[PDB]
Amino acid sequence: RRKFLIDDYLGNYEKALEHLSEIDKDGNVSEEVIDYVESHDLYKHGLALYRYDSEKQNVIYNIYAKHLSSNQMYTDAAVAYEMLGKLKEAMGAYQSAKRWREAMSIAVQKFPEEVESVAEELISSLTFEHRYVDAADIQLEYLDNVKEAVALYCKAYRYDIASLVAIKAKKDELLEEVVDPGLGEGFGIIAEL
Amino acid sequence: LYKHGLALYRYDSEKQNVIYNIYAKHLSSNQMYTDAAVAYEMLGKLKEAMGAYQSAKRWREAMSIAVQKFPEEVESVAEELISSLTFEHRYVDAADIQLEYLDNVKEAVALYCKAYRYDIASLVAIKAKKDELLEEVVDPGLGEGFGIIAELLADCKGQINSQLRRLRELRAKKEENPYAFYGQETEQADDVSVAPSETSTQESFFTRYTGKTGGTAKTGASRRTAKNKRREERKRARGKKGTIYEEEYLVQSVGRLIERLNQTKPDAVRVVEGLCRRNMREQAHQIQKNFVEVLDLLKANVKEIYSISEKDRERVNENGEVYYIPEIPVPEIHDFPKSHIVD
């Protein structure tokens, strides 16, 4: 406690935390260490101190990933949440950070009830900002909507694979309903370009 | 002429049809199998179009035609030709075809793991509701990826540990090689294991074989066998590096290092995520420290090489101990996209 106080007053907060960890070495780091690391952002030091202590790495990761998610640090926060099994926050950060395949896999894995909700939802956002293929495939992954999938196969100027997915579903009407008109407007605007 | 004739019907229909019917064989004989497929489609050759597509390995349209017309002939084109493309590191296309047409789950996920798309393999298994891939398939894939990455990133460490010195003869073995007739000037690819295998010399990397000094014909298929002739008969009568000896390999000494880092970094990110997902969280730090260490070493070591100044037709600056022989244009390779829970 002596060394902790000297270092706390002197501003060397890293060695202060290093000494502070020694007092509660044999139990569960009480709230003192948690509050200290949250106040000084000693998370790297507060983790390296217990880098080999899994039984307290649980709490260190919990608080650190809470900080990560609260500080716009999405992907690492989501991965740490999956490390701790924090399913809800992990899903929120995955689908917030445009993490498509992991979100779909978990949605169909443990909570199929949400598959109809989230998937098409992301299909909106991906289509919003010039991301078609990653959303085009989803419409046939589980939704099995051929037209709403090939619509982004003809819009992305992927004509050959657009016809390919229209044929692998055996749609000779889509050959003139989505492939032909999308094709037409596409090469018209390409001639303009 | 035939070309003028075919251009003469750009506004005629029956003439265009008949010129297809006549000149399609010659056009296919010329070049660019794609035009052969176009002619086959236009003239109704729906079975040899499959052969043309399987010639240059065009596959999606082959299966499309097979599904359209010949449902009995959908297994011959896909199942038989997948192996040839499989055998040469094109694992992704093989796995895609296998999963999408042949209904295979074990080897498809195995080839996804070999393709380092472990999350997509997990999604596929979730479609099949299986979780035993994690140990039978995902575990060996992750282990092999980590092992080969630790192998490859440790390969450049040796090759950069024999490059710093001014006189590039300080390889502890290259200063003794005369390289007069047994020279390895152009296909040189290694600096820490330079010139091994006295008989049938084959370097580690063979993609950097310029063949400049192989001979007058500029080709000998290797530098071990050919005449290996160049200016002023490079021998041991030289002084330092800057006199009559190797001058050309210096530029490629960094091109040999450029490729793998850029071509492997996304694989590195994906395998870090996958290998930490097993909650080790420290072999991910192993990859991180290996990568940052090798990049820092190479970038701090290439700070002693500068441009060749005025480029000259012949090697200059004979006094290599003082006349700045190892000069090389500076490269530009960046660091890794930093993660935080790996810190």
Swiss-Prot record, chain A:
Instruction: State the similarity comment.
Output: Belongs to the ELP1/IKA1 family.
Q: Report the source organism.
A: Saccharomyces cerevisiae (strain ATCC 204508 / S288c)
Gene disruption phenotype: Loss of mcm5U (5-methoxycarbonylmethyl uridine) and ncm5U (5-carbamoylmethyl uridine) from tRNA.
What does the record's miscellaneous section state?
A: Present with 10500 molecules/cell in log phase SD medium.
Q: What is this protein called?
A: Elongator complex protein 1
Q: Which gene encodes it?
A: IKI3
**Localization (cell):** Cytoplasm; Nucleus
Its PTM note reads: Phosphorylation promotes the tRNA modification function of the elongator complex.
What interactions and quaternary structure are annotated? Homodimer; dimerization promotes ELP1/IKI3 stability and elongator complex formation. Component of the elongator complex which consists of ELP1/IKI3, ELP2, ELP3, ELP4, ELP5/IKI1 and ELP6. The elongator complex is composed of two copies of the Elp123 subcomplex (composed of ELP1/IKI3, ELP2 and ELP3) and two copies of the Elp456 subcomplex (composed of ELP4, ELP5/IKI1 and ELP6). The Elp123 subcomplex forms a two-lobed scaffold, which binds the Elp456 subcomplex asymmetrically. In the complex, ELP1/IKI3 interacts with ELP2. In each lobe, ELP2 is tightly sandwiched between ELP1/IKI3 and ELP3.
| Function (record text) | Component of the elongator complex which is required for multiple tRNA modifications, including mcm5U (5-methoxycarbonylmethyl uridine), mcm5s2U (5-methoxycarbonylmethyl-2-thiouridine), and ncm5U (5-carbamoylmethyl uridine). The elongator complex catalyzes formation of carboxymethyluridine in the wobble base at position 34 in tRNAs. Functions as a gamma-toxin target (TOT); disruption of the complex confers resistance to Kluyveromyces lactis toxin zymocin (pGKL1 killer toxin). May also be involved in sensitivity to Pichia inositovora toxin.
- Of the parent protein, the shown chain spans 965 to 1157 of 1349
Curated annotation (Swiss-Prot), chain B:
Region annotated Disordered sits at 209-240
| Residue spans of biased composition, Low complexity class | 209-223
Q: Where is this region: Required for binding to tRNA?
A: 223-241
Share the record's PTM remark: Phosphorylation promotes the tRNA modification function of the elongator complex.
Q: Where is this region: Mediates dimerization?
A: 1-343
Q: What is the effect of changing S204A?
A: Loss of phosphorylation at this site. Loss of elongator complex activity. Almost complete loss of mcm5U and ncm5U on tRNA. Does not affect elongator complex assembly. Enhances interaction with HRR25 and KTI12
How the protein is affected by changing R281A?
A: Disrupts dimer formation and elongator complex formation but does not affect binding to tRNA
**Compartment(s) where it occurs, according to its Swiss-Prot or TrEMBL record:** Cytoplasm; Nucleus
- Reported impact of S197E: Slightly reduced levels of mcm5U and ncm5U on tRNA
> What does the miscellaneous comment read?
Present with 10500 molecules/cell in log phase SD medium.
Relate the assembly described in the record.
Homodimer; dimerization promotes ELP1/IKI3 stability and elongator complex formation. Component of the elongator complex which consists of ELP1/IKI3, ELP2, ELP3, ELP4, ELP5/IKI1 and ELP6. The elongator complex is composed of two copies of the Elp123 subcomplex (composed of ELP1/IKI3, ELP2 and ELP3) and two copies of the Elp456 subcomplex (composed of ELP4, ELP5/IKI1 and ELP6). The Elp123 subcomplex forms a two-lobed scaffold, which binds the Elp456 subcomplex asymmetrically. In the complex, ELP1/IKI3 interacts with ELP2. In each lobe, ELP2 is tightly sandwiched between ELP1/IKI3 and ELP3.
Protein family membership: Belongs to the ELP1/IKA1 family.
Q: Name the chain's protein.
A: Elongator complex protein 1
> What is the species of this protein?
Saccharomyces cerevisiae (strain ATCC 204508 / S288c) (Baker's yeast)
Q: Which residues of the full protein are shown?
A: 1006 to 1348 of 1349
